Symmetry: C5
Subunit: 307 residues, 5 copies
């Protein structure tokens, strides 16, 4: 089991496709291992660049293919470097961009807190043939300055795990198990755009839904309420292209459903108020005085639907 | 006919393009076959990695090209591995991403139940030259946890079929027939997003279409009904970008057509009620009392259009 | 002139980009020719797979490059096969996906009838050096089952034509002429989605445009008509993203222009009716009784604009 | 200075990205030059196809790389052909698709007249090492038949120019200058779609803006005018996705700004008419009679904003 | 430390993805260095073109890989040239397109002033093995002519810096430090499109929000205000697809929030005016006379929200 030391320098994280739960990570990967000693020209290390490492591999030099488990497709790799040292150690540096996938949990879409996971593993060599000793992830080029769409909180957690595989049991009897590296970078979404553009107008429209009751006759109350639905429909088609589709309901969508329930509540109370006239002569006072009780009640409802 | 054992490990299924009936499958494919025995360095199996299997193929090593029948383009393959054993068996492991196509049937778009089909077949070698013995599909990394947009129900069904070809009859007289593997993974769509965002507002708008009749004069009934159409038009341009185009009509679209038929029904009954005045003096009572019969009738109509 | 027999197996046709008049065709192409006889190992034909035909080509084996004339870019080819027979014939099988272009005529966009054209031609070898003998196109995997967005009507017509070129006259004096194969697959669009979602609401909105006249006073007639425009504007921004842009006007767009002309017609008749008051006292009866003549007249107009 | 004869056969021009000022050109390029005479097998010219010219180039055959100056990225080249003649001349044929860029001037977006520019130049060889003798551009497969989105007017103008470079002065003292070919194909946009879908409804809405004044009281005039803005806003979000963004204002956008200025003009005249009541008793006649002077005045304004 | 002279000719800058803070730069890069003298055929410099430099690199010729630090993926390189001189100097010319990233600061989105940064650095050779002497950036093909979406102000600033790396300390003890080149091209956005299409209608709608108060009764004031919200909602879904998402609020979005605050302000003053009736008989004069004080106050507010 040859010892391999991995260093992952995360250049930048961007392109968080919330639709597909993918995110593009750019960076560098550096693998250090020690093999047989060899003769180099001088004591200078021998640097082999891209479109030239492949000739050394065809010659018989051992370069492992450290794949990414959670990647989409194949990483659009850039330059690659191979330093052969006269001491006997080999350093493989590479630049990678990749669309990585993760099980993002969108419980609170404005206020989300996920982790970007890079999962690195040897493709063919098991634990008895290649073992990852340690990884230090240099998340240093990543920095939040309150303009970034994701605040990257803290450092990056590194984990060296050992993973067995069911599908390699048929081809390998007892050694079908691979070493693996998990790099988790905890990030929180910047909620200020959604707070200042997609939530405050819901508050204004729901306040308007409270203020619709101030009219003293029923027909233009109905016309006002149908104008409102339209308004709520227009702003519901607004914010229909920013967020993914999940079984449970994200915060913007409870606000939209709360707006729908409000406008309808207005419908049912004005129809009931029109039908409180038992003989067509009794006025509407106790149910028409909901201009201060219904607003506070739906403030409580909205406080529930935010918490 | 050399026996080939195939193991397909489905890593993840995503990107279901309902527009094009394509879906991206990531995974690994492992082909086991047995050829002539050979001399390897030691009893250790010889592992040949990517950009190095091609040299062995050019040397004269037999590696079949197991194509995907239902794939879009060519699969964006990643790392590939070839283990040559001193016993005499060869194991070809490969990582594939592919846009696969299937005849998806969108009878009930919120409540759909399809199957993702991976169709694997040798490209050039017929049944007399290469026969698939067995396939076990390790659908294990796939798991539903009620956040996924598709619930993957049960295991994956495997089928080894034998398929003849008409276009290879002109070039091969009697042996133009190929072995084939069909892997079907039954999946059901998560309907909760469509139920809680795209169907309940139809219920509210159609209930509003029922409540439009409570006004006691005809002109602002017409103005209210024209406001409503607009509302139904706005929400009909909503949900115009989520679903494909088919000959028959999916559940959201019967709800939209039902809304159109409702609003118009409101138009025709209020024009008829205005024209029930035979001499301009007869009032409208029996046709204006549809605030409790028309709603239940269209509840029955909606129950038909959901079932 | 070596005789080449071509067999094109159309796997599936999809992705009809009406914007760009391109469509993606997946399939296989099989070229049969006869050259010098050669010695093969045994009487078994020699099969040469992908990333190995190129070595035979570099050795000196003659493989023509049968290009597609009407393709966009280069076809994303998959696996390729070359059978060399001891008899003396060579069979080149290949799997191709291509974005093909054609002069689509969108006279009736819901009810369109076009033909998908695959135009195949040798890239460098003229008629005196390579002649296409016959083509049989196996359009068999293509089948309509009334869910497909295009019904493929009948078989595929094959045509072997002879095409001269002006730009190759300067480099080739008398033989600048190439053989060519045209494969035309006649298809008709499935109109049921457009009939049941994009035409019937025009009928409802135009019927509403007829029913706008039932109001007995002029000001709220104007307000209703301005609400209607908005409605027609909203549904005109609907269906603005499904169809291409042409000089002449497709069926949906005559319906939209007919709706605009209707609503305006309503404007001009109500302004004229308000101005039929010569001294401000004469009522409006003969021009206000267009609730049964204007609807039938625009039924005739719509029958013209559909036929 | 070796003489190179270029023939560019433009197959088709499409994909005019007005957003990015790029357009995709498909076609063929044929370079004729004369070098040292050579021995070929027979008097038949020797044809070298794609993935085989590179071996001749590595052998020592001189093939220049005729780059495109105004291309986006690298051209997605297809098949390439190299005819070596026993006489001594070499013909390099190639099929190219490219995203080409040009300084498109969108002064009149419905009625635009631009030119598609293909700029071809040797990458490394200056004028003293490679000189373009003549170019004839065979724009023949391009034809307008009044369905195309661009009418291609006339032939293609060819220009052989000589261009110096500042950045190659530091590496080449006196010969840093390259020959160049400019091919300009003048095209005019098909305006009929914009005339019949994006300009006539502006005329109808502005005519409605003229007809808003016919109401005899002020409050519902204001409500009608606020309905109108909404209408103008809805149709202003319509046609927000077809055209690029420029400093000056294209014809659709002067029509939208003219509509905004109209509706507001209606606002200011009805507020002024309500404020012409000096003591609340004086009626509004001279400023309310703008139902025939304001429409003709804004006909003149629109005639200015079209010309 | 071999001296390398770099010349970067920026052909064109376009495709500024404000969503991803990426921009596509096309251009040429020319590296001059001096190595061992060599024998060339004649005194003519030896030019080695693309798909032929790699053979010289495999032979043993030293060509450094000058990577881009801030690039997305790998640059879609085009033609490459290598001039070997008999004097002893080597010139490597290359054509590159790249998606480059930068920390764009969107404080004033119509009136933005950023800088496009190209960051060039040797991939493997440190300062002791390769040192950049000087760079002159020939920003000459870039020119503004008041049609471009970005005005490129002034020349391009060049900077030769020295950058240490933490992740290369584990593999290189004392020399882990690389020379680097930063090219900054200051650009300002063309604001005229946003001024003439996305800001002036906000002024008109807010002026309408001021003029809503002229009605003399409360119910249709409320209906007018609900029509207005809808208007503000429709134009708020307008301009929802042009700009990125940031923590702080860009100029269009303060205008949208200012419009929301206006319409609501109208709501609260008309509810308060209706509630200033202490016994239902006191009229509303002092709070209804805000048709000239509220407009100027919100002119001051808008002057704050623009400055």
């Amino acid at each position: 089991p040859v010892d391999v030391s991995v260093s992952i320098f995360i250049n930048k994280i961007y392109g968080v496709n919330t639709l597909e739960q993918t995110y593009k990570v750019d960076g560098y990967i550096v693998a250090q291992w020690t093999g047989k000693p060899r003769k180099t020209p001088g004591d200078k290390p021998l640097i082999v660049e891209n479109t030239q490492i492949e000739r050394w591999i065809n010659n018989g030099l051992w370069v492992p293919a450290l794949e990414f488990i959670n990647v989409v497709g194949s990483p659009d790799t850039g330059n690659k470097r191979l330093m052969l040292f006269p001491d006997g150690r080999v350093i493989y540096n590479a630049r990678f961009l990749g669309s990585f996938s993760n099980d993002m949990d969108f419980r609170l879409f404005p206020f989300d807190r996920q982790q970007f996971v890079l999962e690195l593993e040897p493709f063919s060599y098991n634990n008895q043939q290649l073992r990852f000793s340690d990884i230090q992830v240099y998340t240093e080029n990543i920095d939040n300055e309150e303009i970034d769409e994701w605040w990257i909180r803290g450092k990056a957690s590194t984990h060296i795990s050992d993973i067995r595989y069911d599908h390699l049991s048929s081809v390998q009897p007892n050694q079908n198990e691979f070493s693996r590296i998990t790099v988790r970078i905890d990030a929180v979404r910047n909620p200020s755009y959604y707070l200042w553009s997609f939530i405050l107008p819901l508050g204004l429209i729901i306040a308007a839904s409270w203020s619709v009751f101030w009219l003293e006759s029923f027909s233009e109350r109905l016309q006002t309420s149908f104008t409102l639905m339209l308004t709520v429909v227009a702003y519901a088609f607004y914010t229909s292209n920013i967020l993914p589709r999940l079984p449970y309901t994200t915060v913007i969508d409870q606000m939209i459903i709360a707006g729908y329930g409000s406008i309808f509540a207005a419908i049912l109370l004005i129809i009931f108020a029109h039908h409180r006239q038992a003989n067509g002569v009794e006025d509407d006072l106790l149910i028409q005085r909901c201009r201060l009780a219904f607003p506070l009640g739906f403030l409580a409802i909205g406080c529930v639907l935010v918490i």
